Amino acid sequence: MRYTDYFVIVSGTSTRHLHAMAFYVVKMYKHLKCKRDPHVKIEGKDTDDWLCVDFGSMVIHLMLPETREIYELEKLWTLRSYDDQLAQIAPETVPEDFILGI
Amino acid sequence: SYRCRSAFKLLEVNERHQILRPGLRVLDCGAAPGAWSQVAVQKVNAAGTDPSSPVGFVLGVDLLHIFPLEGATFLCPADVTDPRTSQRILEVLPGRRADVILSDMAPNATGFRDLDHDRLISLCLTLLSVTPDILQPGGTFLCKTWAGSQSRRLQRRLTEEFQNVRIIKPEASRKESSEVYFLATQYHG
Amino acid sequence: GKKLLSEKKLKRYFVDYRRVLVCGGNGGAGASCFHSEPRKEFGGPDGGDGGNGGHVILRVDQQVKSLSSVLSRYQGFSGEDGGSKNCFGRSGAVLYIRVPVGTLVKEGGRVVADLSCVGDEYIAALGGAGGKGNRFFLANNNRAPVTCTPGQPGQQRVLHLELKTVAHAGMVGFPNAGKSSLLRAISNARPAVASYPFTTLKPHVGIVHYEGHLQIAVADIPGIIRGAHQNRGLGSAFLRHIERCRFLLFVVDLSQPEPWTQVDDLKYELEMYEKGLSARPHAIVANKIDLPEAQANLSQLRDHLGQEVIVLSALTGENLEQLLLHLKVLYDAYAEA
Amino acid sequence: AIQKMTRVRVVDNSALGNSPYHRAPRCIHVYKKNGVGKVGDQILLAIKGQKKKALIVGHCMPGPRMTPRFDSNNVVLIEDNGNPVGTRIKTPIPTSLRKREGEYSKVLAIAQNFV
Amino acid sequence: FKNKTVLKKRCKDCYLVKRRGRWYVYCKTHPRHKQRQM
RNA sequence: UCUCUUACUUUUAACCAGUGAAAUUGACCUGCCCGUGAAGAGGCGGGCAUAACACAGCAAGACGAGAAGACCCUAUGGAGCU
RNA sequence: ACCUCGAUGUUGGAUCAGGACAUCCCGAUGGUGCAGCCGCUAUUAAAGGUUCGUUUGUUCAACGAUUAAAGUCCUACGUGAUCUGAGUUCAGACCGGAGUAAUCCAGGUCGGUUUCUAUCUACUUUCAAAUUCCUCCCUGUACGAAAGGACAAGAGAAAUAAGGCCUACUUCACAAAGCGCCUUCCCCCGUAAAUGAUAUCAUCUCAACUUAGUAUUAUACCCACACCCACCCAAGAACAGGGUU
Ligand SMILES: Nc1nc2c(ncn2[C@@H]2O[C@H](COP(=O)(O)OP(=O)(O)OP(=O)(O)O)[C@@H](O)[C@H]2O)c(=O)[nH]1
Ligand SMILES: Nc1ncnc2c1ncn2[C@@H]1O[C@H](CSCC[C@H](N)C(=O)O)[C@@H](O)[C@H]1O
Ligand SMILES: [Mg+2]
Ligand SMILES: [Mg+2]
Ligand SMILES: [Mg+2]
Ligand SMILES: [Mg+2]
Ligand SMILES: [Mg+2]
Ligand SMILES: [Mg+2]
Ligand SMILES: [Mg+2]
Ligand SMILES: [Mg+2]
Ligand SMILES: [Mg+2]
Ligand SMILES: [Mg+2]
Ligand SMILES: [Mg+2]
Ligand SMILES: [Mg+2]
Ligand SMILES: [Mg+2]
Ligand SMILES: [Mg+2]
Ligand SMILES: [Mg+2]
Ligand SMILES: [Mg+2]
Ligand SMILES: [Zn+2]
């Protein structure tokens, strides 16, 4: 899975609490950052419930408990093709001879 | 005098069909700036200009604000999609009913044929849902629609509820324009 | 870039109350001309309509913090007049008036808007409808020049913009009870503090930080006096902020021989302003306890006011923590849901 | 290249995208200085009598060499916020989406296949 | 700087000069008093 | 059709050879800018420029060429219709 | 007003623009009732830029989505021997109305012929010395009660404009092209300062003078000249140009 080494999900109390954490983590990152280690960008500051920060080999997701209940990111990444959310949705096939009937 | 040239479209439709009569209750939707309300009040004598002729009633509901008129009351801002606004229409109309429905409402043209069509037709579907408690049996219904795919769909459900569905394209309306008016008289059910 | 040090009399800049006459954009319009062509010399009537007047809206801005920026009279932009060639006038652009967060709009005895939120708007005046042209009125019957009228000047509305400072808690006390001092102690805010009475004329908001990433705003108003209903002292004009404040801080100095009578005077004057203010929930706080005379009178305070009253010093910051506990507890009590 | 008045395919588990309808979704607008939109670019959609923002994820027009080239124009419905309305992306998305400038991390998070 | 055809005094501190071939009014107490000949 | 145009073929084209028109034309050794002419200058005034001579393109100017004149007025001019 | 323009009418639109600044955006300043962020007003600046759809013949306007902004004009309301003919215009017809009628109408509606082989003037590779948006760093800092939120310095990505090119992709195939790739470099003339007289203080100076400020220039490209058999050519209408060991 050609994305990252380590995926991290953390929850928060309030919207402003999430900003606190994300902004501390990025701030501390820069302190301990290697010179050649590229700079990072926080994502979704405008967003209410979901914040994300990508590092080199770590990816972190800051959410409310509300968004955790609807995204189930842990389930997706632990078991890929076998999750419940993929099961409900079925691929649509065109009919043979390509004729629709009512 | 008329606040917009839209009033002339109603005049052409009226003369052919005699949709507006003295002492006949009228509901106008999307009334503002009030060209359709101004032309309606003259014919129904809601202003009470003619002593011998009976006096009607006109109400107009629109999102944008409207100046007051003689013999007409307005409720704005209001949206017909909102069911709350319907009860406010109910209370003001005398005799618990409105005899005439005029629907010249149209959501702002985005400039895409498909998107504009869908919103206006579905807006008329909401009107059709709210007809029973507003429209008196044997009452007349007039709605403004853009031409498209689901124009036929709107016709089919109109033929269920009304005796006759009359497709009108007025001369006052630009010939090159795609706007079409559906008239539906003799309400049953 | 440095903030300029402020004079005590900063009430010169800060404005809480303003009478505004708002008028929308005028119709303008008016064309009564005639088209001519080489082959067709008469051509026909040729009058463009005019654009509609722009509306006036009191958009709320966070970064105004005063009603000083609003003017006595506002006039909306009028729409362009109709020209020849059946050219229409452009409608006027919308006029926006930026107004503080704690603003309230009153027209004719009753409130029309309470714009106490962020981004919320109220239409101050409707722009007037643009007049008709010569091309309008053309029919089979006419072929004639009437320019109508300019038509519908913008709507004239007189309203009172009134600022009520929005906070969770306010402070009430006699002059030189050390309200400003206490605010300076608990918050990072710097209100002007001095020994001479009737300081801090402008209301001062500081917030208090907590561990749960939540902030509680406390307001400091100028000193109040017994009476104040006859506009004695500074009056009770500044009391407008406290309406929005969820609870009150009764700051009482122990320097005075009978501090127990202080709260009695305070509750009486609040009643004089508004009935429910006296019945409104509160906390009583004593100040300047570093002085020995305060320590002497403490016993009789315990006798009259009781144990529930929290005793504090501002200068030395004595028992500040109990205040913070009480602030948080009152918030969690009746400031929720 | 997805420009104005282009039919697109919504490759989401979102209700709005997968709903049966008489119209295919159409590209109202492209958020780029020039009108053409490649992968990663945002575009506005007219679906089911409403406007919705969407992210371009793969397209038929050939791109840079080692980058994949799809057979349908695939978009993911997003809110103005940046939050995707749907929860899952069945269809593979190109990995290139990662390094490109902007809010792509969330969409990567809900995708299963990278090509 | 405000463009004025005729130049006036707003203060005692306020002073005139002829610079760059035009008259100016400078003011240290109130820099708002500044004027330029047009 | 367009975004946004491309490539090739044929016709034309351009060159060599043969045949050989038409509208048009006061005379011309026939420049640019500014002013004048109220508008309108290759040709008048003040400046500037400037060896001579073909061929290929272009259409800004020559109030460009060609017509049974579009419109308004006049004639003690006609004609059709009522 | 006028014996000045127009017998292939005029409005719009296409193409291509030239110019003015009374500057819409980007640049440089002064003041502010300029904390910071947006704002309000004035000076200076025309090198560059200034969107796409729907309705209507639209010029306008309204509406929708954008942008950094979607400027105000002039040019025979620029330009029709470069192009359309949608509206309004000739012969046909209808509705409504006027008129005894023939016929008419500043209304509504349908249809309706756009010629030219360029003689003269003018012109046909002068230089690009490239503009802008966004993101990150600073920094989430200064500032600020908080909410919010900078400037210089620097890094990366794009978009267009100009000039090229074909190794890949693409239309294609000894090649030519874009949908693809490569390159793209100076500052502004408004003010901010000293020292110092008339007027022994002071004062930035249409005083003598001293710094921001060079208060004017690049650098770059080209640059030899037989036969003018014939052939070839990444050169080309012809002519000329390059190669022919
Ligand atoms: N000894 C002592 N003096 C104090 C203490 N707190 C305040 N003071 C004094 O009391 C003064 C109170 O002045 P302010 O805080 O301006 O008074 P106020 O209560 O805001 O009332 P106004 O003067 O009307 O604004 C301070 O300037 C100090 O001199 C305290 O804890 N101990
Ligand atoms: N559901 C709805 N109910 C009422 N008004 C609506 C509406 N949806 C749209 N509108 C409004 O209706 C307006 C058009 S109605 C105006 C018709 C015409 N000018 C007249 O003479 O009355 C739009 O500006 C829109 O804001
Ligand atoms: Mg005219
Ligand atoms: Mg005080
Ligand atoms: Mg030829
Ligand atoms: Mg020959
Ligand atoms: Mg001839
Ligand atoms: Mg001249
Ligand atoms: Mg001549
Ligand atoms: Mg020639
Ligand atoms: Mg004649
Ligand atoms: Mg005669
Ligand atoms: Mg005369
Ligand atoms: Mg003439
Ligand atoms: Mg200027
Ligand atoms: Mg002119
Ligand atoms: Mg021409
Ligand atoms: Mg035909
Ligand atoms: Zn002064």
Tab-separated table of N, CA and C (backbone and C1' of nucleotides) in Angstrom, chain F residues 21-65:
chain	number	residue	atom	x	y	z
F	21	A	P	-5.673	41.585	-76.992
F	21	A	O5'	-6.572	41.424	-75.687
F	21	A	C5'	-7.404	42.484	-75.212
F	21	A	C4'	-8.702	41.919	-74.712
F	21	A	C3'	-9.509	42.870	-73.833
F	21	A	O3'	-10.339	43.701	-74.618
F	21	A	C1'	-9.322	40.792	-72.740
F	22	A	P	-10.367	45.250	-74.331
F	22	A	O5'	-11.218	45.342	-72.995
F	22	A	C5'	-12.592	44.967	-73.003
F	22	A	C4'	-13.100	44.961	-71.596
F	22	A	C3'	-12.956	46.288	-70.865
F	22	A	O3'	-13.966	47.199	-71.304
F	22	A	C1'	-12.141	44.547	-69.494
F	23	A	P	-13.657	48.782	-71.405
F	23	A	O5'	-14.012	49.323	-69.947
F	23	A	C5'	-15.365	49.308	-69.447
F	23	A	C4'	-15.375	49.215	-67.938
F	23	A	C3'	-14.806	50.414	-67.193
F	23	A	O3'	-15.734	51.495	-67.158
F	23	A	C1'	-13.904	48.449	-66.260
F	24	U	P	-15.280	52.974	-67.612
F	24	U	O5'	-13.958	53.232	-66.764
F	24	U	C5'	-13.995	53.341	-65.324
F	24	U	C4'	-12.590	53.397	-64.786
F	24	U	C3'	-11.793	54.599	-65.258
F	24	U	O3'	-12.077	55.687	-64.396
F	24	U	C1'	-10.486	52.636	-65.464
F	25	U	P	-12.117	57.160	-64.983
F	25	U	O5'	-10.601	57.393	-65.407
F	25	U	C5'	-9.604	57.740	-64.432
F	25	U	C4'	-8.282	57.921	-65.123
F	25	U	C3'	-8.231	59.019	-66.175
F	25	U	O3'	-7.924	60.294	-65.610
F	25	U	C1'	-7.225	57.039	-67.006
F	26	G	P	-9.087	61.379	-65.316
F	26	G	O5'	-8.454	62.765	-65.840
F	26	G	C5'	-8.815	63.242	-67.155
F	26	G	C4'	-7.869	64.340	-67.547
F	26	G	C3'	-6.387	64.041	-67.326
F	26	G	O3'	-5.842	63.307	-68.413
F	26	G	C1'	-6.891	66.178	-66.476
F	27	A	P	-4.666	62.267	-68.154
F	27	A	O5'	-3.399	63.209	-67.958
F	27	A	C5'	-2.910	64.054	-69.013
F	27	A	C4'	-1.895	65.008	-68.440
F	27	A	C3'	-0.696	64.356	-67.755
F	27	A	O3'	0.367	64.162	-68.678
F	27	A	C1'	-1.609	66.046	-66.362
F	28	C	P	1.310	62.881	-68.551
F	28	C	O5'	2.077	63.110	-67.165
F	28	C	C5'	1.729	62.418	-65.945
F	28	C	C4'	2.323	63.111	-64.734
F	28	C	C3'	3.102	62.211	-63.785
F	28	C	O3'	4.448	62.101	-64.233
F	28	C	C1'	1.676	63.685	-62.565
F	29	C	P	5.165	60.666	-64.287
F	29	C	O5'	6.325	60.802	-63.214
F	29	C	C5'	7.347	61.770	-63.438
F	29	C	C4'	8.102	62.032	-62.168
F	29	C	C3'	7.281	62.524	-60.984
F	29	C	O3'	7.842	61.973	-59.797
F	29	C	C1'	8.963	64.098	-61.525
F	30	U	P	7.020	60.930	-58.915
F	30	U	O5'	5.639	61.676	-58.653
F	30	U	C5'	5.483	62.540	-57.521
F	30	U	C4'	4.364	62.057	-56.626
F	30	U	C3'	4.612	60.757	-55.874
F	30	U	O3'	4.059	60.908	-54.567
F	30	U	C1'	2.638	60.558	-57.117
F	31	G	P	5.006	60.731	-53.288
F	31	G	O5'	4.163	61.380	-52.077
F	31	G	C5'	3.490	60.511	-51.135
F	31	G	C4'	4.434	60.081	-50.034
F	31	G	C3'	4.112	60.602	-48.634
F	31	G	O3'	3.112	59.779	-48.059
F	31	G	C1'	6.432	60.801	-49.035
F	32	C	P	2.198	60.351	-46.909
F	32	C	O5'	3.181	60.388	-45.661
F	32	C	C5'	3.502	59.211	-44.909
F	32	C	C4'	4.230	59.615	-43.654
F	32	C	C3'	3.524	60.648	-42.785
F	32	C	O3'	2.547	60.101	-41.908
F	32	C	C1'	5.782	61.292	-43.096
F	33	C	P	1.368	61.030	-41.365
F	33	C	O5'	2.123	61.971	-40.335
F	33	C	C5'	2.521	61.470	-39.052
F	33	C	C4'	3.047	62.600	-38.215
F	33	C	C3'	2.050	63.719	-37.945
F	33	C	O3'	1.256	63.500	-36.786
F	33	C	C1'	4.100	64.629	-38.692
F	34	C	P	-0.218	64.114	-36.710
F	34	C	O5'	0.041	65.678	-36.535
F	34	C	C5'	0.322	66.262	-35.249
F	34	C	C4'	0.797	67.686	-35.407
F	34	C	C3'	-0.227	68.684	-35.915
F	34	C	O3'	-1.162	69.097	-34.929
F	34	C	C1'	1.819	69.041	-37.019
F	35	G	P	-2.692	69.348	-35.346
F	35	G	O5'	-2.661	70.759	-36.135
F	35	G	C5'	-2.350	71.953	-35.377
F	35	G	C4'	-2.061	73.111	-36.298
F	35	G	C3'	-3.194	73.550	-37.225
F	35	G	O3'	-4.003	74.503	-36.552
F	35	G	C1'	-1.133	73.450	-38.412
F	36	U	P	-5.560	74.594	-36.860
F	36	U	O5'	-5.615	75.202	-38.330
F	36	U	C5'	-5.369	76.596	-38.555
F	36	U	C4'	-5.173	76.861	-40.022
F	36	U	C3'	-6.375	76.586	-40.903
F	36	U	O3'	-7.314	77.651	-40.858
F	36	U	C1'	-4.427	75.718	-41.918
F	37	G	P	-8.858	77.347	-40.551
F	37	G	O5'	-9.450	76.872	-41.969
F	37	G	C5'	-9.233	77.721	-43.123
F	37	G	C4'	-9.301	76.892	-44.381
F	37	G	C3'	-10.536	75.997	-44.526
F	37	G	O3'	-11.668	76.723	-44.990
F	37	G	C1'	-8.589	74.718	-44.936
F	38	A	P	-12.932	76.966	-44.023
F	38	A	O5'	-12.428	76.458	-42.593
F	38	A	C5'	-12.700	75.120	-42.106
F	38	A	C4'	-12.483	75.023	-40.606
F	38	A	C3'	-12.746	73.658	-39.971
F	38	A	O3'	-11.971	73.482	-38.783
F	38	A	C1'	-14.435	75.190	-39.304
F	39	A	P	-11.155	72.113	-38.518
F	39	A	O5'	-12.230	70.974	-38.822
F	39	A	C5'	-12.104	70.100	-39.964
F	39	A	C4'	-13.212	69.073	-39.966
F	39	A	C3'	-13.112	67.998	-41.053
F	39	A	O3'	-13.304	66.705	-40.481
F	39	A	C1'	-15.260	68.985	-41.078
F	40	G	P	-12.069	65.692	-40.330
F	40	G	O5'	-11.777	65.201	-41.844
F	40	G	C5'	-10.553	65.613	-42.503
F	40	G	C4'	-10.784	65.667	-43.993
F	40	G	C3'	-9.673	66.320	-44.820
F	40	G	O3'	-8.633	65.402	-45.125
F	40	G	C1'	-11.770	67.202	-45.467
F	41	A	P	-7.108	65.779	-44.817
F	41	A	O5'	-6.340	65.144	-46.055
F	41	A	C5'	-6.557	65.647	-47.381
F	41	A	C4'	-5.238	65.910	-48.071
F	41	A	C3'	-3.960	65.512	-47.324
F	41	A	O3'	-2.974	65.035	-48.246
F	41	A	C1'	-3.900	67.812	-47.804
F	42	G	P	-3.064	63.544	-48.837
F	42	G	O5'	-1.642	63.305	-49.519
F	42	G	C5'	-0.475	63.390	-48.682
F	42	G	C4'	0.668	63.936	-49.495
F	42	G	C3'	0.416	65.304	-50.133
F	42	G	O3'	0.768	66.402	-49.298
F	42	G	C1'	1.111	63.756	-51.800
F	43	G	P	-0.212	67.650	-49.244
F	43	G	O5'	0.446	68.755	-50.214
F	43	G	C5'	1.816	68.669	-50.665
F	43	G	C4'	1.891	69.291	-52.043
F	43	G	C3'	1.024	70.550	-52.256
F	43	G	O3'	1.701	71.580	-52.976
F	43	G	C1'	0.574	68.982	-53.935
F	44	C	P	2.301	72.867	-52.214
F	44	C	O5'	1.004	73.659	-51.747
F	44	C	C5'	0.846	75.049	-52.069
F	44	C	C4'	0.320	75.795	-50.872
F	44	C	C3'	1.270	75.874	-49.693
F	44	C	O3'	2.249	76.885	-49.878
F	44	C	C1'	-0.895	75.288	-48.930
F	45	G	P	3.735	76.643	-49.340
F	45	G	O5'	3.588	76.843	-47.740
F	45	G	C5'	3.334	78.186	-47.267
F	45	G	C4'	3.369	78.271	-45.760
F	45	G	C3'	4.532	77.586	-45.035
F	45	G	O3'	5.613	78.488	-44.880
F	45	G	C1'	2.504	76.873	-44.101
F	46	G	P	7.090	77.941	-44.977
F	46	G	O5'	7.306	77.179	-43.574
F	46	G	C5'	7.256	77.965	-42.358
F	46	G	C4'	7.406	77.070	-41.154
F	46	G	C3'	8.510	76.014	-41.230
F	46	G	O3'	9.747	76.604	-40.865
F	46	G	C1'	6.497	75.026	-40.463
F	47	G	P	11.109	75.916	-41.304
F	47	G	O5'	11.339	74.797	-40.172
F	47	G	C5'	11.746	73.475	-40.580
F	47	G	C4'	11.278	72.472	-39.558
F	47	G	C3'	11.805	71.052	-39.763
F	47	G	O3'	13.085	70.927	-39.168
F	47	G	C1'	9.470	70.972	-39.563
F	48	C	P	14.303	70.398	-40.037
F	48	C	O5'	13.963	68.847	-40.199
F	48	C	C5'	13.878	67.985	-39.042
F	48	C	C4'	13.133	66.709	-39.358
F	48	C	C3'	13.763	65.800	-40.397
F	48	C	O3'	14.877	65.035	-39.947
F	48	C	C1'	11.442	65.953	-40.799
F	49	A	P	16.098	64.725	-40.954
F	49	A	O5'	15.485	63.673	-41.981
F	49	A	C5'	15.017	62.379	-41.540
F	49	A	C4'	14.259	61.678	-42.644
F	49	A	C3'	15.085	61.353	-43.881
F	49	A	O3'	15.753	60.121	-43.693
F	49	A	C1'	13.019	62.326	-44.524
F	50	U	P	17.239	59.957	-44.229
F	50	U	O5'	17.059	60.050	-45.816
F	50	U	C5'	16.462	58.950	-46.544
F	50	U	C4'	15.952	59.345	-47.915
F	50	U	C3'	16.983	59.768	-48.940
F	50	U	O3'	17.650	58.629	-49.456
F	50	U	C1'	15.066	61.161	-49.096
F	51	A	P	19.232	58.659	-49.749
F	51	A	O5'	19.299	58.911	-51.319
F	51	A	C5'	18.497	58.140	-52.228
F	51	A	C4'	18.958	58.391	-53.638
F	51	A	C3'	18.242	57.592	-54.718
F	51	A	O3'	17.051	58.247	-55.158
F	51	A	C1'	20.579	57.355	-54.983
F	52	A	P	15.659	57.429	-55.255
F	52	A	O5'	15.742	56.722	-56.676
F	52	A	C5'	16.216	57.436	-57.830
F	52	A	C4'	16.654	56.465	-58.899
F	52	A	C3'	15.822	55.194	-59.035
F	52	A	O3'	14.655	55.426	-59.820
F	52	A	C1'	18.117	54.644	-59.042
F	53	C	P	13.228	54.838	-59.369
F	53	C	O5'	13.167	53.426	-60.096
F	53	C	C5'	13.558	53.289	-61.474
F	53	C	C4'	14.064	51.891	-61.731
F	53	C	C3'	13.167	50.773	-61.227
F	53	C	O3'	12.019	50.556	-62.033
F	53	C	C1'	15.377	50.328	-60.562
F	54	A	P	10.597	50.318	-61.336
F	54	A	O5'	10.123	48.949	-62.000
F	54	A	C5'	9.819	47.798	-61.197
F	54	A	C4'	10.423	46.554	-61.801
F	54	A	C3'	9.721	45.260	-61.392
F	54	A	O3'	8.691	44.917	-62.311
F	54	A	C1'	12.005	45.123	-60.810
F	55	C	P	7.217	44.596	-61.770
F	55	C	O5'	7.415	43.249	-60.953
F	55	C	C5'	7.687	42.022	-61.634
F	55	C	C4'	8.116	40.991	-60.633
F	55	C	C3'	7.092	40.655	-59.567
F	55	C	O3'	5.942	39.953	-60.040
F	55	C	C1'	9.211	40.863	-58.564
F	56	A	P	4.479	40.245	-59.392
F	56	A	O5'	4.557	39.541	-57.964
F	56	A	C5'	4.950	38.159	-57.844
F	56	A	C4'	4.991	37.727	-56.400
F	56	A	C3'	3.789	38.129	-55.559
F	56	A	O3'	2.858	37.076	-55.646
F	56	A	C1'	5.774	38.697	-54.419
F	57	G	P	1.356	37.345	-55.322
F	57	G	O5'	1.274	37.231	-53.729
F	57	G	C5'	0.213	37.936	-53.055
F	57	G	C4'	0.695	38.323	-51.685
F	57	G	C3'	-0.196	39.310	-50.936
F	57	G	O3'	-1.253	38.620	-50.297
F	57	G	C1'	2.068	39.964	-50.750
F	58	C	P	-2.740	39.005	-50.655
F	58	C	O5'	-3.093	40.088	-49.542
F	58	C	C5'	-2.784	39.857	-48.153
F	58	C	C4'	-2.634	41.177	-47.450
F	58	C	C3'	-3.779	42.149	-47.691
F	58	C	O3'	-4.750	41.996	-46.670
F	58	C	C1'	-1.677	43.235	-47.965
F	59	A	P	-6.268	41.685	-47.045
F	59	A	O5'	-6.956	43.118	-46.956
F	59	A	C5'	-6.868	43.892	-45.741
F	59	A	C4'	-6.543	45.338	-46.040
F	59	A	C3'	-7.721	46.200	-46.490
F	59	A	O3'	-7.619	47.453	-45.833
F	59	A	C1'	-6.002	46.285	-48.113
F	60	A	P	-8.463	47.739	-44.506
F	60	A	O5'	-8.315	49.314	-44.342
F	60	A	C5'	-8.303	49.942	-43.049
F	60	A	C4'	-7.378	51.142	-43.070
F	60	A	C3'	-7.537	52.117	-44.232
F	60	A	O3'	-8.613	53.023	-44.045
F	60	A	C1'	-5.255	51.680	-43.906
F	61	G	P	-9.512	53.437	-45.295
F	61	G	O5'	-8.622	54.533	-46.076
F	61	G	C5'	-8.378	55.812	-45.442
F	61	G	C4'	-7.391	56.600	-46.264
F	61	G	C3'	-7.781	56.882	-47.715
F	61	G	O3'	-8.685	57.970	-47.801
F	61	G	C1'	-5.580	56.094	-47.656
F	62	A	P	-9.839	57.948	-48.898
F	62	A	O5'	-9.036	58.207	-50.249
F	62	A	C5'	-8.395	59.474	-50.481
F	62	A	C4'	-7.495	59.406	-51.691
F	62	A	C3'	-8.184	59.371	-53.047
F	62	A	O3'	-8.580	60.694	-53.379
F	62	A	C1'	-6.335	57.870	-53.014
F	63	C	P	-9.853	60.948	-54.307
F	63	C	O5'	-11.067	60.458	-53.403
F	63	C	C5'	-11.453	61.162	-52.213
F	63	C	C4'	-12.409	60.308	-51.413
F	63	C	C3'	-13.786	60.088	-52.033
F	63	C	O3'	-14.180	58.717	-51.914
F	63	C	C1'	-14.011	61.123	-49.905
F	64	G	P	-14.406	57.806	-53.229
F	64	G	O5'	-13.162	56.768	-53.213
F	64	G	C5'	-11.842	57.256	-53.551
F	64	G	C4'	-11.200	56.389	-54.609
F	64	G	C3'	-12.107	55.813	-55.705
F	64	G	O3'	-12.352	56.700	-56.791
F	64	G	C1'	-10.813	54.081	-54.787
F	65	A	P	-13.758	56.652	-57.570
F	65	A	O5'	-13.664	55.299	-58.409
F	65	A	C5'	-12.978	55.232	-59.679
F	65	A	C4'	-13.208	53.881	-60.318
F	65	A	C3'	-14.631	53.596	-60.787
F	65	A	O3'	-15.014	54.192	-62.021
F	65	A	C1'	-13.868	51.759	-59.534
